[PDB]
Amino acid sequence: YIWPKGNNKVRIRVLIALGLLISAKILNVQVPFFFKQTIDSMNIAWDDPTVALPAAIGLTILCYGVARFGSVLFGELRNAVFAKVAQNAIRTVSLQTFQHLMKLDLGWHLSRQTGGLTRAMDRGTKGISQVLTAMVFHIIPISFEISVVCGILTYQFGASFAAITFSTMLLYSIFTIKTTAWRTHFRRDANKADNKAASVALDSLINFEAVKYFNNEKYLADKYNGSLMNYRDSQIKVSQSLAFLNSGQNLIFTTALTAMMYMGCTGVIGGNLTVGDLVLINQLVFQLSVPLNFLGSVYRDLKQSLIDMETLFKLRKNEVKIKNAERPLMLPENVPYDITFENVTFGYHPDRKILKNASFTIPAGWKTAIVGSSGSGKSTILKLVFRFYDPESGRILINGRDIKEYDIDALRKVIGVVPQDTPLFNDTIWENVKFGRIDATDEEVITVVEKAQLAPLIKKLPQGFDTIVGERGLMISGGEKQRLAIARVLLKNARIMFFDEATSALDTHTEQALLRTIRDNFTSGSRTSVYIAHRLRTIADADKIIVLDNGRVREEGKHLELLAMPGSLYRELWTIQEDLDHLENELKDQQELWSHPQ
Amino acid sequence: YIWPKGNNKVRIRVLIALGLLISAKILNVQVPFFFKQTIDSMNIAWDDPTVALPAAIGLTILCYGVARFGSVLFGELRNAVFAKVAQNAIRTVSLQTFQHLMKLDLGWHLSRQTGGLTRAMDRGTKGISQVLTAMVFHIIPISFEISVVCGILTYQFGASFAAITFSTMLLYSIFTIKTTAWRTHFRRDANKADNKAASVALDSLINFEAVKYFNNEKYLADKYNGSLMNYRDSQIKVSQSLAFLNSGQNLIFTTALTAMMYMGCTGVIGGNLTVGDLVLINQLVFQLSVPLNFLGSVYRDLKQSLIDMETLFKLRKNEVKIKNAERPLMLPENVPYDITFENVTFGYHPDRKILKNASFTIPAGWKTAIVGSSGSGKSTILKLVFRFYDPESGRILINGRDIKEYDIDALRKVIGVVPQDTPLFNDTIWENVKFGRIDATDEEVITVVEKAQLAPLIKKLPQGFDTIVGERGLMISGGEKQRLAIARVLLKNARIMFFDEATSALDTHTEQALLRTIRDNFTSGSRTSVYIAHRLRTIADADKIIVLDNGRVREEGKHLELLAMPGSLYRELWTIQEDLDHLENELKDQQELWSHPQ
């Protein structure tokens, strides 16, 4: 909570805002004095009606002006000065939450709904410019002015007046709040009908044929009219409820101001009060109603913004599960890397073990394929090598060392990944290809697009390298996506390379073309390649194939050797998989015959 | 142009509001007088300081209160009274918009983005409560009070003052408006970056793995910060630029009131003005400052809300392309209907013909099947018979009469459709089944749910018949949906019946089970059934099969007769379709093998 103060005392400015806050209200309570004095200083002789105005009193009316203006200006300056404090505290919190969100472990990110975080770390900031704006633009200034106005009234007119001014505020408070909290249970019913009516309109626009296919039209028309009427009947109980707040509020003040003018006019009989003391006590108390209007819709907002600010704080509460230990290693500089699994048992969720006591090696410089049908758990190899997770039993070594003892950032730096479905950031294509290595020369980004065979996309594309792709942009093919991924990892130039089902591009012709550019760019050049696939035909040129079944290692060999091995599972998969490809292609040919006229 | 007056004595409320408006500004301009009188009628002898207060002025201060409060009250009463007129004007436009949109033609609905119509008739309604709230709650009342104050000033103080009041307003307007247009290009740059930072935060959360698989994180953290700093720096240049409006606005009034205190005090030298006329010319002029803060944030709304209201009105401008003619027919009473196509040529987009000079007969009481491979134009038969579109050439008759000559609603009322994809309204199932015929007894809906074999869905559903189905509810299967559709058309009980690809239920077992329920409910019962199908196997019991190819009628006969006819297209299609069914079920068995471990 709070803690805008610690070090970096450039936020001394908070005093200046606080100071400017005082020196704007002081200037306010002083405005009616200049009105009183300017009125009494004109209640005199004037027997010469051609006399000029005493500059001694032309001054008092210049002072009135420059104190009225002084009050607003020193207040508006309080705001913009403190705005530098508010917007800064958010920019600092919004970053620190962002950075910590990405220090969190992957399991966390997959448990948490992303929207509930996008709402949290957005409505969490807006809940801060509502607790400080409440405090500084409203609470303190109206709390001070009440002190000073009731103080001044006490000394210069007696507690007779003070007791009722302060009372007037307290009644205005516990009426405004208690009436406004009574009317939020009205807007919450009002837009409710708006929504009801909204869907009936939308259902009738989406299901336009369906309503046409049946009678209706009239049926849905006054189905609407109903929801439309229930909204009117609710929107009226807003405008009406507003009057009763707006009118009740004026009554509380208007009697306070009417009863005091009276009280004032009795002290004019008793010679205790001048006639300017009437303008004084009226115009003095009236200055307390203006900022009382705002601080009425709040209260609840304060309640809301109090927790939404708390939720946003909890985000940084969440601790980091995958940490590297004391004295972490970087290690080996200029060697090829090998990966090895020692009795690795792992799963997400303790009831379902996925990798069961698996042991194998991914030798250095080789293209090793890890295959298996469903449930094999080849599906989890990368996550473990990349230390997104840690294995329940057994351990995982790179070059004889458990990756746990490695600098979790150093480790991840030497692994490049071409994922099954590549993600597009909402940016330019160029900035997506560049996403692989930030410090890349402009040409590096060009070559790498050429090598990937990505050129024909930028040529087909009107707006070229600067085009916007992404969830909110121009969707490109799976082929062009996977192609971009090849580009990215080419820039990253990692030593260990994963192709995690890189070609489940749901069309045969594209996988075909894709595998070729993969074999051109990633051929045994002292990089250690791991291909995770389920279509065996696409990894048959692998130096080593490790077949998993139900989470355990069943066979290991080369393609021709594995097929020839009697009673192997590899040949069983190969056979099914093959029959499948024949079938689905026999099927596609026949869909064609029935695709066109004859 | 917005029509608050027409042929309904709801316009008395419009008079009352204007009146309540008048008598609210009148009650206001009297507020400074009763203050003046309480000032002058207390500037007297009082040589006796124990005297009671003269009731002749006890009335003068009561008049002050009950004229202050009366001013607000009659103003708040003006609001809630006119809200009834505003809220009625929306409810009327939303309904007529809705009704007319459904007189619109099917192609129209398919070119228009449906959300953008939902936005149109939303931002168009909200664009009325912003042009009506402007006029009645701000523009008119502040212009009347300007006049009355300028009238009063000239009458009781001379045009010297009036010349500065009206000018102060004229200055205040042509400042506020001209200043605010300079600063909206600041808040439009604030949320611009907020949106950029919005995507950077979201992208770093959707693609959390992608950013992890690469270097970055730091790169994406300050890619955020840039937009965060660009927002800070912008929201500050909003807060600053706001103080300058609030201050420039106070300057305009404070000099206006300070110079009037001068001008006021020189008329006190000349013995023309009392000391209470200082409060009068002050407080009366000042009371024009209160609502001027509001009439500033407007103006721009007026421009937006002017066109958003115009775009919404264009919706009723849109002409009805398929209209029924002068003196339309209803006709044939208690006969079965036959449909006949004569030289019908039709397409969407005139250059690309779908149905080409097709003529055939769908005889009455028979089951007629219209089959053909892709491009056949069987896809357009329903749409033409239902008069969603009109054919370019040729005509379509029901019982010898051109369907164009029928009352388009009488026509459609005798056709029931079981479509390929059934839609769900956001309501209960019961209300979705009842949607077929509205005035159906609750029991009819039961029999129809039973006959359709819908019972087991409602038993399986938690909340029974009252369960909420739909896009924002509980989704049901392709099977159950088509099952619902049969229920619907059963309640409608139309004399012509269409099954437009009813059974492309992407599973074998379901097409089968459905096809049975159809054959039990719909067997030649002097209802003429048209089956549009591509699985010929599912219409072999048809009385007539009409085979179309490339938009023209190629063969017509019964099943056995068509297969046996030499060189027929029917046998060809039958053959392709068999092999296809063989393939896709062979493919299903084989995919099963690769779904589970081995």
Tab-separated table of N, CA and C in Angstrom, chain B residues 3 9 16 72 100 104 128 174 188 241 256 297 384-385 403 437-438 444 473-474 485 532 540 545 571 592:
chain	number	residue	atom	x	y	z
B	3	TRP	N	-37.986	15.369	-33.978
B	3	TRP	CA	-39.437	15.269	-33.745
B	3	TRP	C	-39.850	14.989	-32.293
B	9	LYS	N	-50.323	13.751	-27.762
B	9	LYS	CA	-50.280	14.813	-26.740
B	9	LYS	C	-49.286	14.474	-25.617
B	16	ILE	N	-44.674	21.745	-20.774
B	16	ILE	CA	-44.382	21.782	-19.341
B	16	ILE	C	-42.896	21.899	-19.032
B	72	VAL	N	-33.556	25.456	-8.384
B	72	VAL	CA	-33.002	24.130	-8.591
B	72	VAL	C	-34.125	23.149	-8.875
B	100	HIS	N	-37.534	-2.142	-39.539
B	100	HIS	CA	-37.269	-1.862	-40.929
B	100	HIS	C	-36.083	-2.679	-41.395
B	104	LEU	N	-35.478	-5.554	-44.776
B	104	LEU	CA	-34.363	-5.475	-45.711
B	104	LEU	C	-34.051	-6.840	-46.333
B	128	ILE	N	-28.650	10.806	-29.470
B	128	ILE	CA	-29.871	11.573	-29.330
B	128	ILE	C	-29.987	12.140	-27.918
B	174	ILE	N	-15.945	31.398	-27.209
B	174	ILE	CA	-14.938	31.333	-28.261
B	174	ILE	C	-13.529	31.223	-27.687
B	188	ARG	N	-6.092	12.300	-27.102
B	188	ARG	CA	-6.112	11.320	-28.193
B	188	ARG	C	-4.729	10.734	-28.448
B	241	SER	N	-2.520	20.893	-19.484
B	241	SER	CA	-3.374	21.610	-20.419
B	241	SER	C	-4.794	21.790	-19.873
B	256	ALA	N	-14.456	39.989	-15.607
B	256	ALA	CA	-15.832	40.412	-15.870
B	256	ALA	C	-16.523	40.892	-14.595
B	297	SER	N	-17.489	21.025	-22.382
B	297	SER	CA	-17.154	19.647	-22.696
B	297	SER	C	-18.033	19.180	-23.859
B	384	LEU	N	-34.653	-19.095	-53.731
B	384	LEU	CA	-35.510	-18.570	-54.772
B	384	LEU	C	-36.982	-18.859	-54.454
B	385	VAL	N	-37.282	-20.055	-53.961
B	385	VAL	CA	-38.679	-20.406	-53.676
B	385	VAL	C	-39.146	-19.583	-52.501
B	403	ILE	N	-44.746	-16.418	-57.913
B	403	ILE	CA	-44.607	-16.170	-56.479
B	403	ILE	C	-44.370	-14.692	-56.160
B	437	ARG	N	-43.820	-21.836	-33.689
B	437	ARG	CA	-45.118	-21.187	-33.668
B	437	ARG	C	-45.413	-20.616	-32.275
B	438	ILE	N	-45.626	-19.315	-32.243
B	438	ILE	CA	-45.694	-18.576	-31.001
B	438	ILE	C	-46.938	-18.885	-30.176
B	444	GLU	N	-48.589	-28.687	-27.108
B	444	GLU	CA	-48.122	-28.832	-28.484
B	444	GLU	C	-46.586	-28.866	-28.462
B	473	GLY	N	-24.458	-19.375	-23.663
B	473	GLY	CA	-25.227	-20.251	-22.794
B	473	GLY	C	-24.631	-21.643	-22.793
B	474	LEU	N	-25.472	-22.657	-22.975
B	474	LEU	CA	-24.975	-24.029	-23.124
B	474	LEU	C	-25.104	-24.542	-24.583
B	485	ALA	N	-34.675	-28.228	-34.902
B	485	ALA	CA	-35.193	-27.637	-36.129
B	485	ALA	C	-36.428	-28.371	-36.639
B	532	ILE	N	-33.030	-31.047	-50.355
B	532	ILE	CA	-31.817	-30.666	-51.050
B	532	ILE	C	-30.715	-31.485	-50.432
B	540	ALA	N	-33.159	-41.837	-51.522
B	540	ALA	CA	-33.479	-42.836	-52.534
B	540	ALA	C	-34.931	-43.249	-52.547
B	545	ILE	N	-36.474	-37.373	-58.246
B	545	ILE	CA	-35.138	-36.900	-58.002
B	545	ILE	C	-34.799	-36.014	-59.181
B	571	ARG	N	-25.872	-42.162	-61.854
B	571	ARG	CA	-25.038	-43.325	-61.497
B	571	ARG	C	-23.595	-42.937	-61.213
B	592	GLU	N	-8.236	-43.935	-35.452
B	592	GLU	CA	-8.513	-44.437	-34.106
B	592	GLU	C	-7.272	-45.145	-33.546
